[PDB]
Amino acid sequence: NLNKVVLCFDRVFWDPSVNLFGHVGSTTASRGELFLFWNLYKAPILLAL
DNA sequence: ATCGTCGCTGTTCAATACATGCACAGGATGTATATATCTGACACGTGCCTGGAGACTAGGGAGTAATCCCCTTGGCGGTTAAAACGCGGGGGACAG
Known part of the structure; x- marks a missing residue:
């Protein structure tokens, strides 16, 4: 089990x-x-873990 | 313009492969040993005789004492060369 949080x-x-x-x-x-957190798309989006 | 992303590179860091120094099994070649075997040299027994033993003598070599004097020890001192101590360095020893 793991999850992601989109910001x-x-x-x-x-x-x-x-x-x-x-x-x-x-x-x-x-x-x-x-x-x-992650940054790798065009729009300013962070991906929490 | 202005920011972000995508082609082009170097520089460093880490991972891997290779090379060099070291010990420990592994065999084979010789040595030691185990065994069986057969031999002739040693040890003994016998028989025979020459050299050792016994008994006696005569005689001179050695032991023994008594005397001699030569040789050895011993002490003393005086110059004197030889021994002894020290210094410096060079070439001979010894190890790599």
Whole structure:
């Protein structure tokens, strides 16, 4: 089981040259909670994991 | 213009393959050993005789004491060459 969270924005507000950046969790039980987003489509969209 | 993306490259980092130093099984060649076997050289027994043993003598070689003096030890001192100590360095030893 895994899931994805789509975030459609109206303007670029990250680093365009970076396709993905990680976010560590505070605890071990929630390590797989929103740990990585993605950028690789035309529209400014982030894909949470 | 203005931003993003797509063709063209280098530079570094990591992964892999090769080369070099080291130990440990593996065989084969010789040595040691196990065994069977047959031999002739050693040990003994016998028989025979020459060299060792016994008994005696005579005689001189050696042991023994008594005397001699030569040779060896010993102490002393005086110049004196030889031994001893030290220095410096060179060539001979010894290892790679």
